[PDB]
């Protein structure tokens, strides 16, 4: 089948800054028509891929006047002129001239931003979920940038490992802000024995660590 | 304003057979040929199938020419595709996929286009079993209370496969809302949190609700999430 490579696969932009993503084909994408089917698409997660670019250079309806594509043969480019923060997802070139259609690889924009310093929130176990044997502790860092963060547990002062998972938000199409959600998983019997359950939080945007912290049975 | 919805996505045992549907609304369905496409990481995009708008031909991906069916009933106004002897690497999500430009109405100018696309469907391939999840309350309280904003949520666990989908209050609240990505736990099921922010103030005046749906154990959760006093 035709091969579509795109470059780079990870493009970092800072927000209002120009994008350019490269297509290259393994051959001509000129059809017998003398055409050329090349296409861009954009997809954010969760969401279907949406068309951008059709035969090279033409914009769908309702597509942003930022968005361009150029390119001849077997090399294609995709450029926005100045990244907004809706433009953050995936993006696709896709060839229809030789059946069967053919995608990229998918290229990923991530937006720079300014810091932002996660707001820190505590969730103690349920009533319902001690009754089934086991208590989930949540700590969530909201809204912040960049990714990188420090999460960790302490439970009556005892630093906690390998008993605890994290999960990303992809970066956010309004804000270009991240979001963490950090679970600790006990035993009912090893919740019950402890009192002070501590999420701490290092991040570039603090002054210094954040401890969001509850006792056992206040709440 | 043309629109897709896909359905059937299921765990399905390696060897097996699942059928998917695809309900199209608003254009002429018996005016466009119609096509599967999947994504993967293992396979990325990948097409799979058309049949043309008079229902007379079909095209095949290699990958599943001979284990693959696609059909249409324009009368139910549903495209099928029937998956036989399935394997790991067929795990993906389904989408059906048609095109608003139907001027050249054969091969191969309905591949050009490619332009309108349907939410998907999960098939996961595993020697697993189908479990739903359990819906607990992350109660906020003032230790989910951060200045001008308080969070609260609902805790997904033990689920498979992929993936759950969350509401709030039927969709009358969407400002805030993180619904995390799943993470597969060492019991070999899936958790997940969905959150949101709402003004710290708002605390003890409001109702929240997570309508939770597992579609592969045809699960469904409406769970009140409710304060705690601290």
């Known amino acids: 089948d035709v091969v579509l490579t795109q470059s780079p696969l990870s493009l970092p932009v800072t927000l209002g800054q120009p994008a350019s993503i490269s297509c290259r084909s393994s051959?001509?994408?000129?059809?017998?028509?003398?055409?050329?089917?090349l296409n861009w698409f954009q997809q954010r997660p969760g969401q279907s891929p949406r068309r951008l670019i059709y035969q090279v250079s033409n914009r769908d309806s309702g597509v942003p006047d930022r968005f361009s594509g150029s390119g001849s043969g077997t090399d294609f480019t995709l450029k926005i002129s100045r990244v907004e923060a809706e433009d953050v997802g995936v993006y696709y070139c896709?060839?229809?001239?030789?059946?069967?259609?053919?995608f990229g690889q998918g290229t990923k924009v991530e937006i720079k931003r300014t810091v932002a310093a996660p707001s820190v929130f505590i969730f103690p176990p349920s009533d319902e979920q001690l009754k089934s044997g086991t208590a989930s502790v949540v700590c969530l860092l909201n809204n912040f940038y960049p990714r990188e963060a420090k999460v960790q547990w302490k439970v009556d002062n005892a630093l906690q490992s390998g008993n605890s998972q994290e999960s990303v938000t992809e970066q956010d199409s309004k804000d270009s802000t991240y979001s963490l959600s950090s679970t600790l998983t006990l035993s009912k019997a090893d919740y019950e024995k402890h009192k002070v359950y501590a999420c701490e939080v290092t991040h570039q945007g603090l002054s210094s660590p954040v401890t969001k912290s509850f006792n056992r049975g206040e709440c | 304003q043309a629109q897709l919805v896909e359905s059937g996505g299921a765990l399905v045992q390696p060897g097996r057979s699942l059928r998917l549907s695809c309900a199209a609304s608003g254009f002429t369905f018996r005016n466009y040929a119609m096509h599967w496409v999947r994504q993967a990481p293992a396979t990325g995009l990948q097409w799979l199938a058309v049949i043309t708008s008079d229902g007379r031909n079909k095209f095949y991906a290699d990958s599943v020419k001979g284990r693959f069916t696609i059909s249409r009933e324009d009368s139910k106004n549903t495209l099928y595709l029937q998956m036989d002897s399935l394997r790991g690497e067929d795990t993906a999500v389904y989408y059906c996929?048609?095109?608003?430009?139907?001027?050249?109405?054969?091969?191969?100018?309905?591949?050009?286009?490619?332009?309108?696309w349907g939410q998907g469907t999960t098939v996961a391939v595993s020697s697993a079993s189908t479990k739903g999840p359990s819906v607990f309350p992350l109660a906020p309280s003032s230790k989910s209370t951060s200045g001008g904003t308080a969070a609260l949520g609902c805790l997904v666990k033990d689920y498979f496969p992929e993936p759950v989908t969350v509401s709030w209050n039927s969709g009358a609240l969407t400002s805030g809302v993180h619904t995390f990505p799943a993470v597969l736990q060492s019991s070999g099921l899936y958790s997940l949190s969905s959150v949101v922010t709402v003004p710290s103030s708002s605390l003890g005046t409001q109702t929240y609700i997570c309508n939770v749906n597992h579609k592969p154990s045809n699960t469904k959760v409406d769970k009140k999430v409710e304060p705690k006093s601290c």
């Open positions: 996929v048609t095109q608003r430009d139907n001027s050249r109405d054969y091969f191969p100018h309905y591949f050009h286009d490619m332009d309108v």
């Open positions: 051959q001509s994408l000129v059809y017998s028509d003398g055409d050329t089917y």
């Open positions: 896709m060839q229809g001239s030789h059946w069967p259609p053919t």
